[PDB]
Structure 1
Amino acid sequence: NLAPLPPHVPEHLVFDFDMYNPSNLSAGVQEAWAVLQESNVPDLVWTRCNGGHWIATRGQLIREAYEDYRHFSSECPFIPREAGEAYDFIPTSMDPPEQRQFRALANQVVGMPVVDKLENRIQELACSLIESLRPQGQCNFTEDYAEPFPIRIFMLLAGLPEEDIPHLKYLTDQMTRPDGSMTFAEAKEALYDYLIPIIEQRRQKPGTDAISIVANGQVNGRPITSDEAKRMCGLLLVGGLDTVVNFLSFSMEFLAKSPEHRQELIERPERIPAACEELLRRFSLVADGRILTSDYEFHGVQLKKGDQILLPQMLSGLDERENAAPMHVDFSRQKVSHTTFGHGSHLCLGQHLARREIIVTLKEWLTRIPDFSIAPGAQIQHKSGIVSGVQALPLVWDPATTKAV
């Protein structure tokens, strides 16, 4: 369905891109989105899909809009927008100055010191999962590793029972690549409903887990309230349970298709941190937006107050104006330019945990199962949304070529 074109939007700027089901999804999701950056396509277009909204196609515009919170606000309505409902996550649905006090507390639960503490449990789980798969000579990567690895580490961090995974995983899916069984407002409320009693419990009997830290936290010397804690934890669950999961499948799919890139990392393990960054650029997967606070002309385009604008984080690094041969994976790339973890006051606070999980995966995997391929005849399908992903990734390998550790 295409929403009627608003009177202020010029017809020459129309480009009906569907972020939840892009026209060329079969070429790969990043490729489908990259069609927006072609010379024939304007730097800023309006799509009538999903209620109608702007889409900044170039990294320069995407970066600029994320820096200007005064015009481009994070008090985001959904896409498609829902009547009387909008995002209220903390600190993600807030604009500075208000947003700032909340980042510190969030940073305290998923930040660097926390990642350092998790280090050995992270290494242990990756190794444990990979060793059990190794003798099989085959696996369904998405469900066998991509999902359990990051999710179990997060549940551990959050002090949540692993039995709650199917439920939470279903809900976070609805917040990124919804199948239509729930609205964003219902999915979000269910996440909140799950958290409420948990926050109360830990507020009274605190632990060292992420939920306890938020529940008993302080924002700028003031105690966070139950509701603010609920809204922060809700956001953390989405980030912690969904984002890395999908990214890992893009990376493993690529590696399974490029023996040359596998061998490179095998021979030069010191290049893994660099490979992680490069893969983060090439397989960037998030795309959310902002809302205009007033009538404003941006790069020759008249934007109206209340207009929604999607600023795809995934697009910046794929822009040939930012990186030469952007669709090519080059571990030795000199200046890996991207906005995969965001840009502006809302830079991803879980970026350190993400990188650590990717780097460990790459080392542990290539060290035990160095040679692997995609199952013969398999058609890998990608799904587009606020956080794009891989439907399934059947891999195969000869156990005789594996190294047991």
Structure 2
Amino acid sequence: NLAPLPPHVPEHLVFDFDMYNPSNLSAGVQEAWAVLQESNVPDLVWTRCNGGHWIATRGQLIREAYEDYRHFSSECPFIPRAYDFIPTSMDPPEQRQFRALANQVVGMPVVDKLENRIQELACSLIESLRPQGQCNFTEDYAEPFPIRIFMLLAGLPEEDIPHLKYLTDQMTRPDGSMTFAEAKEALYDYLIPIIEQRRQKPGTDAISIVANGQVNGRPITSDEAKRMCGLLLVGGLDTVVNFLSFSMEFLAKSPEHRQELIERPERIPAACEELLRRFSLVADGRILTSDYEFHGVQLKKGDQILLPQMLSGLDERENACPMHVDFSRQKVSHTTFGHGSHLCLGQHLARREIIVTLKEWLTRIPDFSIAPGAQIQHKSGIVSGVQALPLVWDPATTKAVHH
């Protein structure tokens, strides 16, 4: 149920919100967190669920905290207090350095070069769906898409997907075959030999670049390698799947917006940016490194604070009618990719993945809707998401474009 209030918390601040299971889930997952952005609700509140933690409800305080790395540690970004990826729990000499490395394998220039093959892939995935007049978009496009793209990026064989995809599935959605420990170990088991192999040789692929990286002028350890690769892989899975989904959920609910883009495809940039704001999905936190008064509140050492990336951007103080999707919104503001020293390294890849998805989809399937009489179901978490997206469309009205 709820863990006991610690002595330093004013009752007028309590407000019990289960991030794993919010009251209004049925409304939709954002809408459900937006309860924390009602007027009567304090800017920074405390809930007793999940062990008891804080929660900043407004943009300014969120930004401010990820800016404040000295006070707000990334030792335990997850509520509740398991895992060991690089570079999340690491400080600050090494930190910037590892981030550089990765940025080297997923930065803009890399994405720019890949766009082409990314296009090809989305196109084959859509085409194989196009005739059917329906699908579970979530299972049939969104899930197969980001895994494949990592394979492209890391130059790995298509034939590894099933098993690889199995391991990452176990990390976030165990069926019970493997503990979180086991699925990670096995990930590494599969990775190590390719690292060594490619440390020897030097390729252009993502694993090669990472494998031959210096850190403190010293060569990167194998142990370090598999970890970065590790997060590069799983970091770009659920978030994209899930996000692609909200975005398809809304386009399918809205022919107007769907039209805006069929007519003027150059709007897709800002569009995509605006959906990233509207359907932000990640809810991470940090841990206090010692007592600290913050915006008029006494935080205790060891404390944990949810700092919901989802929130900024839905905060009225930062965008007007935050709940309205306007592709022509002048200033789109969000921390959908986080803030401060840990900002999302994949952020560039992600955008392109979205943008391609959207362009290559609509240019081929202009007309689609939710399957008659299905209630789309959201789930809440560190990464929020969509259970399924049953879609339908008359095939006559599609078009096949080739490569």
TM-score bin, normalised by smaller chain = over 0.9
User: Identity over aligned residues, as a percent?
Assistant: 100
CA distance in 1, matches of 2:185, 2:77: 15
The answer as to whether partners of 1:29 and 1:383 remain within 8 angstroms in 2 is yes
- Quote how far apart the aligned CAs of 1:23 are: 1.6
Residue 345 to residue 71, structure 1, CA distance change in 2 (3 Å) = same
Change (3 A) 1:173 1:31: farther
Distance 1:384 1:66, change over 3 A: same
CA distance in 2, matches of 1:26, 1:32: 8
Alpha-carbon distance, 1:183 to partner: 6.2
Q: Separation in 2 of the partners of 1:396 and 1:252? A: 12
- CA distance in structure 1 between the partners assigned to 2:225 and 2:367 by the alignment: 45
Q: Is the 8 A contact 2:137 2:391 kept in 1?
A: yes
Q: 2:163 maps to which residue?
A: 167
TM-score, normalised to structure 1's length?
0.93
Structure 2 CA distance for partners of 1:222 and 1:5, relative to 1, 3 Å = same
CA contact (8 A) 2:377 2:386 kept: yes
For residue 282 of structure 1, what is the aligned residue in structure 2? Answer: 278
Residue 186 (structure 1) shift: 5.4
Aligned partner of 1:61 in structure 2 is 61
The whole-number CA distance in structure 2 between the counterparts of 1:52 and 1:185 is: 25
Cα deviations across residues 211-254 of structure 1 (Å, max 9, x unaligned)? 22111112253211112112211211121222211110110010
Partner of 1:302: 298
- Following TM superposition, by how much is the alpha carbon of 1:376 offset from its aligned partner in structure 2, in angstroms? 0.3
Q: What is the CA–CA distance in structure 2 between the aligned matches of 1:23 and 1:189, rounded to whole Å? A: 36
Deviation by residue 1:38-66 (Cα, 9 ceiling, x = unmatched):
11221111222112211111111000000
Kept after mapping to 1: 8 A contact 2:94/2:216: no
**1:247/1:230 Cα in 2 relative to 1: closer, same or farther (>3 Å)?**
same
Cα pair distance change 1:286/1:376, threshold 3 Å = same
2:131–2:395 Cα contact (<8 Å) kept: yes
C-alpha deviations, 1:172-229, integer Å up to 9, x for none?
Answer: 4455566787765555445444433332332234432212211111225321111211
Task: Verify the 8 A CA contact 2:79 2:306 in the aligned structure 1.
Answer: no
Kindly indicate whether the alpha-carbon contact (under 8 Å) linking 2:365 and 2:399 is maintained by their aligned counterparts in 1: yes
Q: Deviations over 1:96-142 (max 9, x none)?
A: 24311111001011111111121111010111111221111111101
Contact kept, 8 Å, 1:141 with 1:395, in 2: the verdict is yes
| 1:265 Cα deviation from its structure 2 partner | 0.5
Identify if the C-alpha distance between structure 1 residues 77 and 137 changes in structure 2 by more than 3 Å, giving closer, same or farther. Answer: closer
1:176–1:385 Cα contact (<8 Å) kept: no
Asked whether the 8 Å contact 1:91–1:232 carries over to 2, the reply is: yes
1:354-386 per-residue CA deviation (whole Å, 9 max, x = no partner) reads 111111111111111001111001111111111
Cα shift at 1:170: 4.6
- Give the match's secondary structure for 1:187: helix
The answer (yes or no) to whether the contact 1:74–1:92 under 8 Å persists in 2 is yes
The one-character-per-residue Cα deviations of 1:279-323 (angstroms, maximum 9, x if unpaired) are 000011111111111100111111111111110101100001100
Conserved? CA contact 1:24–1:32, under 8 Å: yes
Bigger mean CA deviation after superposition, 96-105 or 392-401: 96-105
Q: What is the rounded CA distance, in whole Å, between the counterparts of 1:129 and 1:229 in structure 2?
A: 31
Q: Secondary structure at the match of 2:306?
A: strand
Specify the alignment match of 2:19 in structure 1.
Answer: 19
Please give the secondary structure, in 2, of the residue aligned with 1:354.
helix
Does the CA contact (< 8 Å) of 1:104 and 1:219 recur in 2?
A: no
Residues 157 and 316 (structure 1), Cα distance of their counterparts in 2 relative to 1, 3 Å cut: same
- Take 1:247 and 1:278, find their aligned partners in 2: how far apart are those partners? 12
Query: Alpha carbons of 1:7 and 1:173: their partners in 2 closer, same or farther (altered >3 Å)?
Result: farther
The separation in 2 between residues aligned to 1:39 and 1:185, in whole angstroms, is: 43
Residues 314 and 17 (structure 1 numbering): CA distance in 2 closer, same or farther, change over 3 Å? same
Taking a change above 3 Å as real, the CA distance of residues 96 and 132 of structure 1, as seen in their structure-2 partners, is same
Alignment coverage as a number of residue pairs = 401
Which of 223-232 and 371-380 deviates more? 223-232
Taking a change above 3 Å as real, the CA distance of residues 285 and 90 of structure 1, as seen in their structure-2 partners, is same
Q: Does structure 2 retain, via aligned residues, the 8 Å contact 1:177–1:387?
A: no
Whole-angstrom distance in 1 between the partners of 2:328 and 2:263: 14
CA distance in 2, matches of 1:176, 1:308: 21
Distance 2:19 2:183 in 1: 19
Task: Tell me if structure 2 keeps the 8 A contact 1:380–1:392.
Answer: yes
Shift of 1:145: 0.9
- Cα–Cα, structure 1 residues 313 and 77, in superposed 2: closer, same or farther, change >3 Å? closer
Instruction: Note if contact 1:78-1:184 (Cα within 8 Å) is conserved in structure 2.
Output: no
5+ residue gaps, structure 1, are none
**C-alpha distance 165-24 of structure 1, shift in aligned 2 (>3 A):** farther
Distance 1:193 1:10 in 2: 49
How large is the RMSD of aligned CA atoms in angstroms? 1.9
3-state secondary structure, aligned to 1:79: coil
| Contact 1:176–1:386 (8 Å) recurs in 2 | no
CA contact (8 A) 1:293 1:306 kept: yes
Q: 1:214 aligns with which of 210, 215, 220?
A: 210
Q: Matches of 1:194 and 1:12 in 2, distance apart? A: 51
Contact 2:94-2:215 at 8 Å conserved across structures: no
Corresponding residue SS for 2:135: strand
What is the distance in 2 between the residues matched to 1:52 and 1:211? 40
Change beyond 3 A, Cα 1:223–1:53: same
